[PDB]
Design an enzyme around this catalytic site. Structure first.
Site, short mmCIF file in Angstrom:
data_model
loop_
_atom_site.label_atom_id
_atom_site.label_comp_id
_atom_site.label_asym_id
_atom_site.label_seq_id
_atom_site.Cartn_x
_atom_site.Cartn_y
_atom_site.Cartn_z
N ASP A 140 3.92 5.21 122.56
CA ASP A 140 4.66 4.32 121.67
C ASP A 140 5.18 3.04 122.32
O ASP A 140 6.19 3.06 123.02
CB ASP A 140 5.83 5.10 121.04
CG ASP A 140 6.65 4.26 120.06
OD1 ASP A 140 6.17 3.21 119.62
OD2 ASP A 140 7.78 4.67 119.71
N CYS A 154 2.48 -6.02 109.53
CA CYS A 154 3.36 -6.36 108.42
C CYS A 154 3.91 -7.76 108.56
O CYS A 154 4.69 -8.05 109.46
CB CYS A 154 4.52 -5.38 108.33
SG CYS A 154 5.50 -5.71 106.86
N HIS A 200 14.85 30.78 94.50
CA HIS A 200 14.94 31.28 93.14
C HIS A 200 16.37 31.83 93.02
O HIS A 200 16.98 32.21 94.02
CB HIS A 200 13.97 32.45 93.00
CG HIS A 200 14.08 33.44 94.12
ND1 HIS A 200 15.06 34.41 94.17
CD2 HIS A 200 13.38 33.56 95.28
CE1 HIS A 200 14.95 35.08 95.31
NE2 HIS A 200 13.94 34.59 95.99
N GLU A 223 6.21 33.68 98.20
CA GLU A 223 6.85 34.17 99.42
C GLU A 223 5.84 34.83 100.36
O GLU A 223 4.78 35.28 99.93
CB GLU A 223 7.95 35.19 99.06
CG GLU A 223 8.67 35.81 100.27
CD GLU A 223 9.41 34.77 101.13
OE1 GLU A 223 8.80 33.72 101.48
OE2 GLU A 223 10.59 35.00 101.46
N1 ADP Z 1 3.71 0.88 108.04
C1 ADP Z 1 5.02 0.30 108.17
N2 ADP Z 1 5.17 -1.07 108.16
C2 ADP Z 1 6.42 -1.65 108.28
N3 ADP Z 1 7.59 -0.98 108.42
C3 ADP Z 1 7.42 0.41 108.43
C4 ADP Z 1 6.18 1.13 108.31
N4 ADP Z 1 6.35 2.49 108.35
C5 ADP Z 1 7.67 2.55 108.49
N5 ADP Z 1 8.40 1.36 108.56
C6 ADP Z 1 9.85 1.07 108.71
O1 ADP Z 1 10.14 0.68 110.02
C7 ADP Z 1 11.42 1.14 110.43
C8 ADP Z 1 11.33 1.80 111.79
O2 ADP Z 1 10.83 0.80 112.65
P1 ADP Z 1 10.54 1.13 114.17
O3 ADP Z 1 9.66 2.33 114.11
O4 ADP Z 1 11.73 1.09 115.04
O5 ADP Z 1 9.67 -0.27 114.55
P2 ADP Z 1 9.05 -0.59 115.92
O6 ADP Z 1 8.99 0.70 116.66
O7 ADP Z 1 7.72 -1.14 115.53
O8 ADP Z 1 9.78 -1.66 116.81
C9 ADP Z 1 11.96 2.01 109.30
O9 ADP Z 1 12.93 1.25 108.59
C10 ADP Z 1 10.73 2.29 108.42
O10 ADP Z 1 11.01 2.47 107.03
O1 F6P Z 2 11.35 36.56 107.11
P1 F6P Z 2 12.41 37.50 106.76
O2 F6P Z 2 13.74 37.20 107.62
O3 F6P Z 2 11.94 38.99 107.07
O4 F6P Z 2 12.80 37.56 105.23
C1 F6P Z 2 11.59 37.78 104.51
C2 F6P Z 2 11.97 38.16 103.09
O5 F6P Z 2 12.88 37.35 102.42
C3 F6P Z 2 12.74 37.71 101.04
O6 F6P Z 2 12.49 36.52 100.28
C4 F6P Z 2 14.01 38.48 100.59
O7 F6P Z 2 15.15 37.67 100.65
C5 F6P Z 2 11.59 38.74 100.93
O8 F6P Z 2 10.89 38.66 99.71
C6 F6P Z 2 10.79 38.38 102.20
O9 F6P Z 2 9.96 39.45 102.60
#
Ligand code: ADP
Ligand code: F6P
Ligand code: ADP
Ligand code: F6P
Lengths: 449, 449
Positions: A120, A150, A249, A318
């Site tokens: 980066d 841009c 749910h 689930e």
């Molecule tokens: N494709 C894009 N063109 C222009 N701005 C963007 C794009 N994707 C994200 N952003 C905006 O840029 C900002 C982050 O910029 P940043 O990543 O710090 O810029 P740089 O790293 O190029 O100096 C956020 O506000 C985000 O919404």
């Molecule tokens: O990943 P965990 O911690 O075992 O929980 C899983 C469970 O959670 C549930 O949604 C119950 O809360 C089950 O239907 C599912 O098996």
């Protein structure tokens, strides 16, 4: 022919009756993603988000922000003067920071198990990119370039106000001066900026040029599956403001009995939650709102109370507990002691017999995530394990912590996109329910004791 | 709140205790895909393939080839003279054929349940495209353009030899003259050809420009999910020659007992098939070959006999029969008479209790199909239902026939890409096995009888 099934993942592997002295060898060439563009173009935002996505789908990825290397070597930013093209000493420091970052990139991809390294930085000159390409070639790394272009002052201005002025570089500036300082900084790069030229100079480079915040795209020679997935992802994310709501749910009959899986209906409380959810949605005052449910009864009954069109996704069902479906954890521990213990030691990778693991959940949920990125306001009504996976993606939680995230019943997680990630707000709708959260929980096999 | 579960699909829907006199209403605005480009650029190939894919994933799509309308109105092609820009009468006929096709497009999308209409023609002028855009606007149809640009004479020459000279238009020409006639034909369009200009004239059109047979892409403003999926698909298909092999796991113990599902190992015959499969692969003499299996034991034991690296896909696991897993069809008919009969009446949509349908299979297999498109030589070792779905995609079989396709054990289906589709060759490896194919199989509820 003679295979054995792994106890945790339930994967059939060839039995390797290792010889007297077993050998190992060990540990798809890694990739260096090269960000390109003027400052305030979203490079870091894209770097971090793409990285959040890759790690979540299981591709170990790491961002190497040259910016942080410079902040580490120089201590405290004073002004855009540091970035002047005539600043010989700073030009040197910047290059040294780039090389040190590449050093770590090399160590990450060749020695630490990393697969994707996101470099980066501005990388605005053919000369700098050529150096990185050389680095990639000599280390047997593939190279993919992402350039954000841009030229909309309104966008740049907004970007600066949203992430730059609150940056640590401007810890001693007010909005007005930070903004002014950043604009001068940008101007420093404008003279030497050589955008990617896929139709001529960069015909042979693998790249994607993101234009007008994802309005248009220029894609040149994708090399493999990972680059293909990256391109797809980048072309479907946007920055329009919206809100994502996630909740389970309403409480169901199986919840009351402490039983897992199944397809039971809402209890009297779950139904109260459904009504309360409708009131909450109503008060959020959203122009438009998409509602998604799983295909299981409880999430659907919940959505019915909203009096809004909703869409059923089998992918939101689930986690499938296989032969343990319909059982209480007590019955699992008693009937399948070994399975119970195995899941407790490796909850993310563990797969139920003829069922699933959180790892399978994630793969099942990829399309949901991709569509969620494309959408605007969306309310997802799901289940515990599913919600944990979704939340892990949005909040960049690891696979190890994913299965233990807290996602209580009758509680709405409101996610709002801000800066480089998602702000999360919890809103309990004041309706009682049971709690389904379960936290994490040798001698004779050594001599004397 | 009060929902009922559909018997076939097992989908929870609100019970609509229709009033005395129930109302219906009935039947996501449809889309007209507009192909663009000089002749011999792969427009029809792309039209047909994209259409094959959309229908398979469940999006009713139809190709409207203006070419066929002209062949219907003029009877027999004589020469490129028909296409001269100075041929006033033919220019008229061509336009009339375009309008009649649009007429059918309108009837398809607005009255027959179609969702995507692929308008396959040259549409090389802004004037013609403007007319189609007008047609779309007035009917409330979205419009997406796909332009194939190729200026490599070697590619055009190959394209002409592969699909044009054997075209019905040249039924009375030999290779030499057909080729010569087609080249002159192409030249007719060259003067008035106005390619899409996303950066200026076509800034507001939704489009993808496919360049150098998928080497480079220019994508401009995707509007919805379907266009997004279309773009992704188009950017991952290629035309390099390769071969796709599909076969089931060697015969297994459950096959011998006539039991469905499960995770049993290979029988003595299945193992013989595995050895024979290895011999067959060896004799095909493929430079490189990727091998994919499901995560079930039988397909893996089969791949082990190849002594080649292979990759396990959970998505290739056989259809999940839910509570019927491990049962013989006899036991299903006796224990679940109603489920048995329901599946027989709607085999594609029917979902097993806590299990799957062929419809779910297809959704599960989308990623496999996409990756298969990206790859070169690949051997997929799977199961009956899964193979039927994959074959249905490659051979463009409907959902109604998909569950009844014949895919016998110990038999390799060799698929080779040719012209506008896939040539299929069957190769039985001469090893006995059982047969698991099952073909498709009122009174008192009317007065007197
Ligand atoms: N494709 C894009 N063109 C222009 N701005 C963007 C794009 N994707 C994200 N952003 C905006 O840029 C900002 C982050 O910029 P940043 O990543 O710090 O810029 P740089 O790293 O190029 O100096 C956020 O506000 C985000 O919404
Ligand atoms: O990943 P965990 O911690 O075992 O929980 C899983 C469970 O959670 C549930 O949604 C119950 O809360 C089950 O239907 C599912 O098996
Ligand atoms: N993007 C492409 N560019 C050039 N040729 C292609 C492309 N995609 C497919 N083809 C080739 O084009 C041929 C089919 O051409 P066809 O579809 O009849 O052309 P057209 O319809 O443009 O007159 C096949 O040989 C196929 O391999
Ligand atoms: O779709 P069909 O015709 O019921 O066949 C399905 C079955 O085929 C099998 O692969 C057995 O041949 C079973 O595992 C699966 O349930």
């Amino acid at each position: 022919l003679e295979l054995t099934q792994s106890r945790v993942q339930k994967i059939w592997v060839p039995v390797d009756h290792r010889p007297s002295l077993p050998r190992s060898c060990g540990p798809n060439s890694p990739t260096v993603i090269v960000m390109v563009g003027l400052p305030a173009r979203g490079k870091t935002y894209i770097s971090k988000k793409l990285t959040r996505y890759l790690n979540w789908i299981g591709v170990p990825t790491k961002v190497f922000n040259v910016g942080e290397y410079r902040r580490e070597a120089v201590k405290q930013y004073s002004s855009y003067n540091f970035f002047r093209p005539d600043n010989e000493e700073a030009m040197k420091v910047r290059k040294q920071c780039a090389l040190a970052a590449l050093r770590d990139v090399k160590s990450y991809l060749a020695k630490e198990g990393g697969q994707i390294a996101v470099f980066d930085a501005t990388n605005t000159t053919r000369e700098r990119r050529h150096m990185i390409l050389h680095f990639a070639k000599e280390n047997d790394f593939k190279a993919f370039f992402i350039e954000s272009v841009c030229d909309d002052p309104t966008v740049v201005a907004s970007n600066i106000m949203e992430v730059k002025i609150s940056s640590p570089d401007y810890k001693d500036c007010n909005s007005a001066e930070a903004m002014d300082d950043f604009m001068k900084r940008i101007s420093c790069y404008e003279a030497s900026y050589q955008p990617l030229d896929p139709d001529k100079c960069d015909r042979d480079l693998s790249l994607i040029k993101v234009i007008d915040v994802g309005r248009r795209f220029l894609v040149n020679r994708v090399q493999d599956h990972i680059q293909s997935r990256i391109v797809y992802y980048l072309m479907n994310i946007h920055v329009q403001p919206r809100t994502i709501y996630l909740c389970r749910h309403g409480e169901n009959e199986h919840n009351l009995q402490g039983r897992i899986g199944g397809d039971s209906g809402l209890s009297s409380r779950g139904k109260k939650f459904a009504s309360a959810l409708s009131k909450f949605v109503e008060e959020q005052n959203l122009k438009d709102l998409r509602v998604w449910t799983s295909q299981l009864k409880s999430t659907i009954q919940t959505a019915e109370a909203l009096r809004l069109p909703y869409e059923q996704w089998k992918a939101l069902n689930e986690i499938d507990a296989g032969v343990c479906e319909e059982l209480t954890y007590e019955e699992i521990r008693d009937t399948y002691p070994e399975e119970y213990a195995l899941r407790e030691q490796d909850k993310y990778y563990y797969r139920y017999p003829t069922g699933e693991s959180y790892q399978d959940l994630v793969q099942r949920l990829e399309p949901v995530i991709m569509e969620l990125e494309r959408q605007e306001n969306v309310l997802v009504i799901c289940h515990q394990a599913v919600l944990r996976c979704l939340l892990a993606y949005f909040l960049d939680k690891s696979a190890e912590e994913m299965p233990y995230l807290k996602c209580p019943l009758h509680t709405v997680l409101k996610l709002t996109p801000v800066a480089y990630g998602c702000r999360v707000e919890s809103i309990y709708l004041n309706v009682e329910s049971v709690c389904t959260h379960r936290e994490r929980s040798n001698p004779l096999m050594r001599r004397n004791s």
